[PDB]
């Protein structure tokens, strides 16, 4: 028994006519995906299908495989090709055949690190190939066999043998097939082509080896219940009885998140929207705590021209809780906006404002010229120029050593006023009050779904209830400390929790040489809710599909439960279910004056078997 990537039994494989001659010609070979490997089949009796291409971009920005065959050698290369739009192999006679087979496949091959030359692969001889690519290893399997069908796949059994295990290290997403037509836009000809394509899926198979070295039979353990029984018994034959095979579950159909109302909004609109702003040498540092910060408003607005955010990602900030948040405010020129960074130097960087190399904050900033400037300029923004020493980060003093800024409302960008807001987050030994918002959902009901009630996670079905909570309790618990009921944070109503269905599956079958029919029992499940076809009959042990409720009673043959038995009967043949009987009535003729005495006798011999001992073993 082995689990691998196999092609499922009894499926549809696609049949491509690469070239069709109706009158005229029709050339079309597409580019197909490469999911988990491919099964490729051909039966054409000529040298037309002559290799393959594998790759992702199929351009010169990445590497690509190339497998070519010319009836004398097989050449495998891994290079950085730039393939044509319609790649094909052109043989041109100088002569009829055996000439310089040109390469119209590509036009460039640079910087490439593989080569493999060997004996031909493709040596009416139906040919089958299987391709795989796992852990930087390209594996090929092949097999040839002669057939006589007109147009179909034979009904037999053959096993493919390994060919090559090349150690390439590239990524593969798409693949394409090569054809070498002829030479004789319309200056080339060809006869015909057709091939079968199929895809592999992860399955589990049961294979049989004979006394010699070959594989003879296989069983797929997903086709029907009988195959599942054969695979779970590790045998190709099954005796009469009832066997347990697998479990039955119900899957969630949606997701639910419920949280209390969004209040106590944190005043982020005071440091951004404000008629007055501070200067470079005198900040407006503000502390923020015990509030709910709406970060998504800031980075979803089409009015900020600088949002480079170091330390943390701008999107995960909604799932982090801090203790304190500090906000600054500068009004500087447009040229030094780049100087506010963990690493930078200059006038403003070293004299007015400096930042450490572990900032874990960011520098949201924008432009404003129609409001912060007037007709006369109003040079009311000052800054320092000379200092006795470099100023360390997170330190500034209040105090002609100061000069004003022009900000003339005609100059180009690079000198116009720009407003900068700088935020920092801190986590000290404290309950970390500051947290981000939490969104909710529409509270669907009556389906087995997943719920997140204010911190309670789980799966199940919700419904109304009659319980009454004291007006401070949130949820309830059972005897075994399992959650039973909850309360909606927004509507303050009580809801119950019930697990969605689950059970086991049993298969009822007669002996294997008799018939191939089965019946299926789903245990303890009311099957008005079963996802799933024959007669349906409900018992006290679950419900049964595939049997008819016969009308009489006999002795028990295959026990099921609660006094119900099943058997293979003849009246056409079928499987019937009934209630077992105990015996035949034997009412005795009792009076107060009659006796019965036997007159003649028999001698009887019976047998009894008893085990006495077992085997003596020892382990070191």
């Amino acid at each position: 028994s082995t689990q691998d990537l196999f092609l499922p039994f009894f499926s549809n494989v696609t049949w491509f006519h690469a070239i069709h001659v109706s009158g005229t010609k029709r050339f079309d070979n597409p580019v197909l995906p490469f999911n988990d490997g491919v099964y490729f089949a051909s039966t054409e009796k000529s040298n037309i299908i002559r290799g393959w291409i594998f790759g992702t971009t199929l351009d010169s920005k990445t590497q690509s495989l190339l497998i070519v065959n010319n009836a004398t050698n097989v050449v495998i290369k891994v290079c950085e090709f730039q393939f044509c739009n319609d790649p094909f192999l052109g043989v041109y006679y100088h002569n009829k055949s055996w000439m310089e087979s040109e390469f119209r496949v590509y036009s460039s091959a640079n910087n490439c690190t593989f080569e493999y030359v060997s004996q031909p692969f493709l040596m009416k001889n139906l040919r089958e190939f299987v391709f795989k690519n796992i852990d930087g290893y390209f594996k090929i399997y092949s097999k040839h066999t002669p057939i006589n069908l007109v147009r179909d796949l034979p009904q037999g059994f053959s096993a493919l043998e390994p060919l090559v295990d090349l150690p390439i290290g590239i990524n593969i997403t798409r693949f394409q097939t090569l054809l070498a037509l002829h030479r004789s836009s319309s200056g080339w000809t060809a006869g015909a082509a057709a091939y079968y394509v199929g895809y592999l899926q992860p399955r589990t198979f049961l294979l049989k080896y004979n006394e010699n070295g070959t594989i003879t039979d296989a069983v797929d353990c997903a086709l029907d219940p009988l195959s599942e029984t054969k695979c779970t018994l590790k045998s190709f034959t099954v005796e009469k009885g009832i066997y347990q095979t697998s479990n039955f579950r119900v899957q969630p159909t949606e997701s639910i998140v419920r949280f209390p109302n969004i209040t106590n909004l944190c005043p982020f609109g005071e440091v951004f929207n404000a008629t007055r702003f501070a200067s470079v040498y005198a900040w407006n540092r503000k502390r923020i705590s015990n509030c709910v910060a709406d970060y998504s408003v800031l980075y979803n607005s089409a009015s900020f021209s600088t949002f480079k955010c170091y330390g943390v990602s701008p999107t995960k900030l909604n799932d982090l809780c801090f203790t304190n948040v500090y906000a600054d405010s500068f009004v500087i020129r447009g040229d030094e906006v780049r100087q506010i960074a963990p690493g930078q130097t200059g006038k403003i960087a070293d004299y007015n404002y400096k930042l450490p190399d572990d900032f874990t904050g960011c520098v949201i900033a924008w432009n404003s010229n129609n409001l912060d400037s007037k007709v006369g300029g109003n040079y009311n923004y000052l800054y320092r120029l000379f200092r006795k020493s470099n100023l360390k980060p997170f330190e500034r003093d209040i105090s002609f050593p100061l000069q004003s800024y022009g900000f003339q409302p005609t100059n180009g960008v690079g000198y116009q006023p720009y407003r900068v807001v700088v935020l920092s987050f801190e986590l000290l030994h404290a309950p970390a009050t500051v947290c981000g918002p939490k969104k909710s959902t529409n509270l669907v009901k009556n389906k087995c779904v997943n719920f997140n009630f204010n911190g309670l996670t789980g799966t199940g079905v919700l419904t109304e209830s009659n319980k009454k909570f004291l007006p401070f309790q949130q949820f309830g618990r059972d005897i075994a400390d399992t959650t039973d009921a909850v309360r909606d944070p927004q509507t303050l109503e009580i809801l119950d929790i019930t697990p969605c269905s689950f059970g086991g599956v049993s298969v009822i079958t007669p002996g294997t040489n008799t018939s191939n029919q089965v019946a299926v029992l789903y245990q303890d499940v009311n099957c008005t809710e079963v996802p799933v076809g024959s007669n349906v009959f409900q018992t006290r042990a679950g419900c049964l599909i595939g049997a008819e409720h016969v009308n009489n009673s006999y002795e028990c043959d295959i026990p099921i439960g609660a006094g119900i038995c099943a058997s293979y009967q003849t009246q056409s043949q079928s499987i019937i279910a009934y209630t077992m009987s105990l015996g035949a009535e034997n009412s005795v003729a009792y009076s107060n004056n009659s006796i019965a005495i036997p007159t003649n006798f028999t001698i009887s011999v019976t047998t009894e078997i008893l085990p006495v001992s077992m085997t003596k073993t020892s382990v070191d």
Partner: antibody, heavy 128, light 108 residues
């Protein structure tokens, strides 16, 4: 010459389900990637899902999980999308679109081109 | 989930001038995969530029695009009366595919 056509407008009540179809004519349709895009009135565009008919496994967005289902029929060459458990916010216009160059690699999808051919639009109004 | 933000909410211009539209991403787009769409009222969108540099055939030569990393830009050098519509930026280097927010360009 590849063109896609959709069905007509629909009006629904909350709690029901809707099914929209997309018929493409003039191409292979087998190795394409058929997507689905939703545009609300006076809003932007959103991504719902997509499918490659030859493979048979679709990809869904996280928001529309357990509520939408995308399938395809190769013989009639038609893609279906079904939306269940309707709310009052599921009133928008739906578009088919097509990505010409798509691959698979593992169970996920990989795109090497943008959508070039679009449908026409089907309005689904949900109210009572 | 990569989030794209279009910096100018609305642009008002005049015929014969040039425009400039930006599309900033929260992270770095993988392999610089970006596409630009132009939509008019009552009609489906239309693809103009893919790969942030390449241009689909049949699109006028006045449209161009550039950028990389987390900053991408689109330019129309010579505006025309038929160029006033909504514009969107989309990324397809990962999953799920995410669109922009739109940027109106009109004179009315």
């Amino acid at each position: 010459q590849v063109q896609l056509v959709q069905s007509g407008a629909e009006v629904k009540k909350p709690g029901s389900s809707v099914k929209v179809s997309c018929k493409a004519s003039g191409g292979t349709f087998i190795n394409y990637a058929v997507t689905w895009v939703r545009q609300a009135p006076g809003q932007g565009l959103e991504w719902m899902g997509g499918i490659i008919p030859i493979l048979g496994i679709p990809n869904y967005a996280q928001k529309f999980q357990g509520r939408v289902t995308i399938t395809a029929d190769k013989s009639t060459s038609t893609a279906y999308m079904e939306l269940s458990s309707l709310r009052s916010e599921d009133t928008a216009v739906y578009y088919c679109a097509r990505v010409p160059q798509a691959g698979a690699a593992q169970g996920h999808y990989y795109y090497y081109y943008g959508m070039d051919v679009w449908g026409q639009g089907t309005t689904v109004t949900v109210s009572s | 989930e990569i989030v794209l933000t279009q910096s100018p909410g609305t642009l008002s211009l005049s015929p014969g001038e040039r425009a400039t539209l930006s599309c900033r991403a929260s992270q770095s787009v993988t392999s610089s995969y970006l596409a630009w769409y132009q939509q008019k009222p009552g009609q489906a969108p239309r693809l103009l530029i893919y790969g942030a540099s390449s241009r689909v055939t049949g699109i006028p030569d006045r449209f161009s695009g550039s950028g990389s990393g987390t900053d991408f830009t689109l330019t129309i050098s010579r505006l025309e009366p038929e160029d006033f519509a909504v514009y969107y930026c989309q990324q397809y280097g990962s999953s799920p595919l995410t669109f922009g927010g739109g940027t109106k360009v009109e004179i009315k």
